[PDB]
């Protein structure tokens, strides 16, 4: 009851994070041509996959 809608939210927060993670990866990359040095990072969206796919094995 307190996890029926509560899980419906974490579902959405995974999507937002996935987008934010990607959006930031793009914005930071676009600084490579503006600033002195660039931040070498790596977006592990694989982790996100397991998360969201794993969340469904608790929705059904």
């Amino acid at each position: 009851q307190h996890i029926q809608l509560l899980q419906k939210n974490v579902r959405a927060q995974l999507v937002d994070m996935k987008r934010l993670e990607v959006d930031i990866d793009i914005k930071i990359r676009s600084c490579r041509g503006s600033c002195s040095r660039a931040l070498a990072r790596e977006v592990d969206l694989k982790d996100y996959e397991d998360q969201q796919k794993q969340l469904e094995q608790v929705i059904a």
């Binding site: 934010l20 993670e21 793009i26 040095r37 931040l39 998360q51």
Partner: protein
């Protein structure tokens, strides 16, 4: 269902990282990147005249299309198919933001060129958009052809050649016109996406369209929905219709393949060329070069 705690934990931890990264970069941005592009002596109206005047190397040059126009910088490709190519648009590493407003697309933005290893001249092109005023003026000096090139993350490449290319002035919202196609990338500009059929296809044709930026909607998608325009936040400026088969000025997704749940608005706003790789694939390399036709 208590393992849901590890999920929120994972995410909050993710935020700490993201916050640190953004912070570091912001700190790195306290100072800008620099270049020292000493100017080649040989100059001319555009790159075609320059290679005819002996400028055989691909690098940055100064051109003055008209005595009424302030001379400006551009990257000249003197090696691809007969040379004499004036680079109008270039993507290759995602180092430049292309999700800009009308004025930047009008004036031009990005890096024309950067220094090679140790050389005192900028022989490598950077990522940039020459500028709609400049592109318009160049294409209207006389018959102009356009060469569009792209490369995927697998290393294969294709091209789309347009024997005729014209961009009207700002008063005409930079209307684009292209004809005489030939190539391997698929005629996305004139025929729309090859995966579509009927009307869904014709509405993805770029030929004839006006230019649009997320802050200036001139697309072919008439209506009155403010959140439903072809060009949205972070999206690039392009000759959208309703909406696109190709977008060289899209967001630079690393790796190529991308999904709707990665996109800021759930749309394929990447560097796309459907006629070749489909709707959810972002090129590793994309560029646009023009030259006087003969």
């Amino acid at each position: 269902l208590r393992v849901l705690r590890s999920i929120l934990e994972n995410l909050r931890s993710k935020i700490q990282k993201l916050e640190s990264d953004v912070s570091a970069q912001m700190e790195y941005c306290r100072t800008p990147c620099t270049v020292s592009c000493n100017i080649p002596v040989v100059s001319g109206k555009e790159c075609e005249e320059i290679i005819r005047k002996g400028g055989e190397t691909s690098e940055m040059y100064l051109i003055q299309p008209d005595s009424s126009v302030k001379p400006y910088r551009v990257y000249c490709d003197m090696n691809t198919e007969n040379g004499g190519w004036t680079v109008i648009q270039n993507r290759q590493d995602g180092s430049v933001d292309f999700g800009r407003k009308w004025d930047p697309y009008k004036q031009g933005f990005g890096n024309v060129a950067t220094n090679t290893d140790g050389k005192n001249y900028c022989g490598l092109p950077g990522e940039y958009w020459l500028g709609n005023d400049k592109i318009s003026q160049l294409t209207r000096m006389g018959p102009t052809e356009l060469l569009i090139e792209m490369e995927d993350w697998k290393g294969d490449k294709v091209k789309a050649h347009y024997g005729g290319f014209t961009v009207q002035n700002e008063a005409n919202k930079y209307q684009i016109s292209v004809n005489k196609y030939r190539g391997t990338a698929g005629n996305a500009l004139m025929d729309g996406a090859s995966q579509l059929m009927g009307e869904n296809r014709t509405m993805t044709i770029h030929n004839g369209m006006f230019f649009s930026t997320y802050d200036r909607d001139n697309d072919g998608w008439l209506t009155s929905d403010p959140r439903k325009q072809c060009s949205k936040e972070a999206g690039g400026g392009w000759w959208y219709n309703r909406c696109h088969a190709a977008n060289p000025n899209g967001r630079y997704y690393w790796g190529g393949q991308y999904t709707w749940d990665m996109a800021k608005h759930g749309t394929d706003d990447g560097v796309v060329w459907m006629n070749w790789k489909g709707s959810w694939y972002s090129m590793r390399k994309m560029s646009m070069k023009i030259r006087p036709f003969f």
